Design a protein around this ligand. Structure first.
Ligand SMILES: C[n+]1ccc(Cl)cc1CNC(=O)[C@@H]1CCCN1C(=O)[C@H](N)Cc1ccccc1
Ligand SMILES: *[C@@H]1O[C@H](CO)[C@@H](O)[C@H](O)[C@H]1NC(C)=O
Ligand code: NA
Ligand code: NA
Lengths: 28, 11, 251
C-alpha cells in the first residue's frame, strides 16, 4: 500500500511516540 | 480470562 | 514481552492477535500487511513437537486491539481466515529456519486510526537498516516473564546483534534467514519477546522516508530475557520472494 507504515495517530498528524527517538539515535 | 466476543464471529 | 512497557494508543496499528476459537485464548501475534493479508510465524500454526497443527477454522484474527482480554467494542475488528500458507521449506524439525506464514482474510478489513498496514522492506531498506546496534521494536501480548500476563499491548526496543555474537550465544544452528536482537549482559538494559509474542513484528522506522518497516517476525529464544541469550527473528526481506509469490498467485 502506498500509505503503508504511516500511523494515523502519529506520522499522519506529525506526532511522535514516546520512544521512537531511541530508534532514530541508533541509526548512525 | 478473555471477554466473550460477539457470536457472529464464531459461526 | 519481558521488561517492556505499555504501548501508546495507535502505536502499532498493524498489530494482530491470533485468537483460538476454542478454548478462547491468545495463540500468537501477527501483523497486517494489506487489507487482506496477515503475516505471522509458521510455528504459530504448525509445530508437530507440541501437537500444533491449526486449520483455518480453528482461528480468528483480531485487529486494532490494545487491551489483551477485553472485547474492544467499536475499535477492534475480527476477521475469519480464508487460507493459511506456510513456507514450503519451514524447518520445524530442527531450528525453525524460514519461520514464516501468511494468512488471507475472508474479507478485507477497514483501516482506521487503530488499524493500518506496516510496510515490508525492499533490498535497499534491509541493507541500510539491518545492522548491528541499530534498534527495532517488538510488540505483543505475550508473557511478562519466562515463568504474568499484560493488561494491554507491550512494547520494547532492542538492538540488532552481530551475527557471530548471535551464533556464540546458542548451540542451535543459526541461518541467514534469521537475525538476533537484544542487550548484552554488559549493556545493563534488557528486554525480550516471550511465549505468546511469537509471530509478532520486529519493526524499524526508516530515517530516510519516516515509514515503519517490518524487518523481523518473533521466532525463537532460549527462555525469555535470559542473560547471554538473544531473541531470534525471521528475516523478512530474505523471504520476501516467497511472500510476493504467494500474494501474486492467491491474491
Ligand atoms: C520463547 N521465545 C523467546 C524469544 C523469542 Cl524472539 C521468541 C520466543 C517464542 N518462540 C518459541 O517458544 C519457539 C517455538 C518452538 C520452540 N521455541 C523456542 O523458542 C525454543 N525455546 C527454542 C527452539 C528454537 C528452534 C527450534 C526448536 C526450539
Ligand atoms: C498438518 O495438518 C495437515 C492436514 O490438515 C496434514 O496433511 C499434515 O500432514 C499435518 N502435518 C504437517 C503439515 O506437518
Ligand atoms: Na554456537
Ligand atoms: Na538476553
Amino acid at each position: 500500500e502506498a500509505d503503508c507504515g504511516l500511523r494515523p495517530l502519529f506520522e499522519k498528524k506529525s506526532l511522535e511516540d514516546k520512544t521512537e527517538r531511541e530508534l532514530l539515535e541508533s541509526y548512525i | 480470562d478473555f471477554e466473550e466476543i460477539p457470536e457472529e464471529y464464531l459461526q | 514481552i519481558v521488561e517492556g512497557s505499555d504501548a501508546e494508543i495507535g502505536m502499532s496499528p498493524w498489530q494482530v492477535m491470533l485468537f483460538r476459537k476454542s478454548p478462547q485464548e491468545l495463540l500468537c501475534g501477527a501483523s497486517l500487511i494489506s487489507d487482506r493479508w496477515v503475516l505471522t510465524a509458521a510455528h504459530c500454526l504448525l509445530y508437530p513437537p507440541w501437537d500444533k497443527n491449526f486449520t483455518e477454522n480453528d482461528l480468528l484474527v483480531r485487529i486494532g486491539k490494545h487491551s489483551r482480554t477485553r472485547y474492544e467494542r467499536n475499535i477492534e475488528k475480527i476477521s475469519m481466515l480464508e487460507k493459511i500458507y506456510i513456507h514450503p521449506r519451514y524447518n520445524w524439525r530442527e531450528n525453525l529456519d524460514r519461520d514464516i506464514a501468511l494468512m488471507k482474510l475472508k474479507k478485507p478489513v477497514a483501516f482506521s486510526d487503530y488499524i493500518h498496514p506496516v510496510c515490508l522492506p525492499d533490498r535497499e531498506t534491509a541493507a541500510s537498516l539491518l545492522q548491528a546496534g541499530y534498534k527495532g521494536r517488538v510488540t505483543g501480548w505475550g508473557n511478562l516473564k519466562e515463568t504474568g500476563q499484560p493488561s494491554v499491548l507491550q512494547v520494547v526496543n532492542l538492538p540488532i546483534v552481530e551475527r557471530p555474537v548471535c551464533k556464540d550465544s546458542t548451540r542451535i544452528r543459526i541461518t541467514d534467514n534469521m537475525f538476533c536482537a537484544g542487550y548484552k549482559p554488559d549493556e545493563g538494559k534488557r528486554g525480550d519477546a516471550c511465549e505468546g509474542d511469537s509471530g509478532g513484528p520486529f519493526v524499524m522506522k526508516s530515517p530516510f522516508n519516516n515509514r515503519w518497516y517490518q524487518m523481523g517476525i518473533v521466532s525463537w529464544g532460549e527462555g525469555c530475557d535470559r542473560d547471554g541469550k538473544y531473541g531470534f527473528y525471521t528475516h523478512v526481506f530474505r523471504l520476501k520472494k516467497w511472500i510476493q509469490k504467494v500474494i501474486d498467485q492467491f491474491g
